[PDB]
Amino acid sequence: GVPAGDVEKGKKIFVQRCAQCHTVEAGGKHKVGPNLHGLFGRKTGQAAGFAYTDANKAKGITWNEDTLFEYLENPKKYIPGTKMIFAGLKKPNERGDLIAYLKSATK
Numbered sequence: 001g002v003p004a005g006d007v008e009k010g011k012k013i014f015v016q017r018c019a020q021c022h023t024v025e026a027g028g029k030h031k032v033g034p035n036l037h038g039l040f041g042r043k044t045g046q047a048a049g050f051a052y053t054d055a056n057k058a059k060g061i062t063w064n065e066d067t068l069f070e071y072l073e074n075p076k077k078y079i080p081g082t083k084m085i086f087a088g089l090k091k092p093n094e095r096g097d098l099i100a101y102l103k104s105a106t107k
């Protein structure tokens, strides 16, 4: 599975790699990417009000540690045709820290 991560390290990754396009708080605004509040346990393509690609909506998985760990390594491999332009977080320790941050930040 996905080992535990350090949320402070994960927050730094989020700020430097994700925050340009995403907010996490309940009621936070959509930007280029969707607000991520309530992500874990919810299917792809479900943030209310955001215009997703058909590719994202079609994927149909439930976001959790394992699916995020695969996605964030290479987003376009996991969801071909997605409009999220993000090369990927290649190091597993960095993905794990980021996922620990997301699990807590989007509760």
Ligand code: HEC
Pocket (backbone or CB within 6 Å): 014, 017, 018, 019, 020, 021, 022, 032, 033, 034, 039, 043, 044, 045, 046, 047, 051, 052, 053, 055, 056, 063, 072, 081, 082, 083, 084, 085, 086, 089
């Ligand atoms: C702007 C250049 C982006 C950056 C940098 C990151 N994300 Fe993103 N993300 C963006 C878009 C435009 C979308 C929608 C894609 C589509 O095809 O419609 C997304 C989507 C996600 C998702 C899926 C959300 C869901 O299904 O509701 C997640 C989990 C996600 N993005 C996470 C994420 C993280 C953690 C990032 C930093 C590593 C990151 N994104 C960067 C645009 C952009």
